[PDB]
Amino acid sequence: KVFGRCELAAAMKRHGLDNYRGYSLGNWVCAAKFESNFNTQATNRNTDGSTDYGILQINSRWWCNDGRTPGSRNLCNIPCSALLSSDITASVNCAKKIVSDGNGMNAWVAWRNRCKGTDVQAWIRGCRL
Ligand SMILES: [Cl-]
Ligand SMILES: [Cl-]
Ligand code: NA
Ligand code: NA
Incomplete structure (x- = not known):
């Protein structure tokens, strides 16, 4: 599923996630835009052989199991495929662990290079929340 900006903010x-660990909602929307273009199906392989999955591009080396990342951890205790669902629950729950x-x-x-230190509230402007 490709989310709209305000639809994702509301979800x-x-x-x-709003103000979770002090990060306002716009930070999370901005990160999702530049990690995945708001597409829950996004995947991207890394040089080390791990893969990033879903709307927040969560990496198999540490956070999920994809069956092909040797020696990796599964700190969110989920298959990486669960992070590609149209339901963002698993991605959000794992992101809460990462940010903590x-x-x-x-x-x-992408958050550090494209969102940090910018007016992230613009990403939720106009939305009914
Ligand atoms: Cl922090
Ligand atoms: Cl959802
Ligand atoms: Na904000
Ligand atoms: Na893993």
Whole structure:
């Protein structure tokens, strides 16, 4: 599913991401735009052989099991395919674990390079939330 901007903002609010660990909703919408273009099906392979999955591009080396990333961890205890669902629950629940692991949203490269230090509230402007 390819979400609209405000549709995704509302879904992420419903799932508790607004101000989660101090990150306002616009931060999460901005990260999703540049990680996946709001597409839950997005996948991208990394140089080390791991793969990123879903709307927030969660990496199989640490967070999910895809059966082809040797020695990796599954810290969210889920198959990576679960992160491609039109229902964002699994992606949100795993992202909550990631953002709490000490580095905040700096775990998402696109957030650090394209969202951090910008007017992220613009990503929720106009939306009914
Ligand atoms: Cl959803
Ligand atoms: Cl933080
Ligand atoms: Na915001
Ligand atoms: Na893994």
